[PDB]
Amino acid sequence: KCVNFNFNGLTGTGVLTKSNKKFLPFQQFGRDIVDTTDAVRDPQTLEI
Amino acid sequence: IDGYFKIYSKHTPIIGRDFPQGFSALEPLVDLPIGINITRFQTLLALN
Amino acid sequence: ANQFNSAIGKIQDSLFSTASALGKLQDVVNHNAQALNTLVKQLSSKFG
Ligand SMILES: *[C@@H]1O[C@H](CO)[C@@H](O[C@@H]2O[C@H](CO)[C@@H](O)[C@H](O)[C@H]2NC(C)=O)[C@H](O)[C@H]1NC(C)=O
Ligand SMILES: *[C@@H]1O[C@H](CO)[C@@H](O)[C@H](O)[C@H]1NC(C)=O
């Protein structure tokens, strides 16, 4: 759904879907080649 | 940096005798905001 | 007719393997994509 989110001080607006990108144990959120926020990790359940 | 003590470490298996040729990134382990002044160190060797 | 058939039969080779030609369309696509990417990347700048 189209909502607004705030993850550990990272904010934005978009839709959130289940992904398959595997983050490293320490990486928090993923960015793109054009350097824009693309994928974030849920701080509670460590879900991507 | 900025009063923080950052730890980056990696335990690479050895193929050979000493300093094998290869690449391996060092993932951070723990960040600690101490904020003190460091100029010298000395490694500790176990004595049995 | 035989000379023309032989000449037309080598078109599919010299068009790609020899490079040279066929670079203008690739240059157009690359330039437009690069301009778009540079425009998007500017959003992360601080500008002071
Ligand atoms: C934040 O606290 C929550 C409290 O629920 C933790 O969620 C639990 O996590 C454990 C370990 O993965 C699971 O077995 C439980 O089922 C979770 N509980 C619920 C209600 O979902 C969460 O792991 C904590 N986060 C961190 C980073 O420690
Ligand atoms: C320690 O570093 C801090 C950082 O500004 C500074 O205030 C202080 O004077 C430094 N002390 C020494 C002995 O270098």
Curated annotation (Swiss-Prot), chain A:
Q: Determine the domain of life of the protein's source.
A: Viruses
Assembly information from the UniProt record? Binds to host ACE2. RBD also interacts with the N-linked glycan on 'Asn-90' of ACE2. Cleavage of S generates a polybasic C-terminal sequence on S1 that binds to host Neuropilin-1 (NRP1) and Neuropilin-2 (NRP2) receptors. Interacts with host integrin alpha-5/beta-1 (ITGA5:ITGB1) and with ACE2 in complex with integrin alpha-5/beta-1 (ITGA5:ITGB1). May interact via cytoplasmic c-terminus with M protein. May interact (via N-terminus) with host bilirubin and biliverdin, thereby preventing antibody binding to the SARS-CoV-2 spike NTD via an allosteric mechanism.
Role played: Attaches the virion to the cell membrane by interacting with host receptor, initiating the infection. The major receptor is host ACE2. When S2/S2' has been cleaved, binding to the receptor triggers direct fusion at the cell membrane. When S2/S2' has not been cleaved, binding to the receptor results in internalization of the virus by endocytosis using host TFRC and GRM2 and leading to fusion of the virion membrane with the host endosomal membrane. Alternatively, may use NRP1/NRP2 and integrin as entry receptors.
Q: What is this protein called?
A: Spike protein S1
Source organism of this protein record: Severe acute respiratory syndrome coronavirus 2 (2019-nCoV)
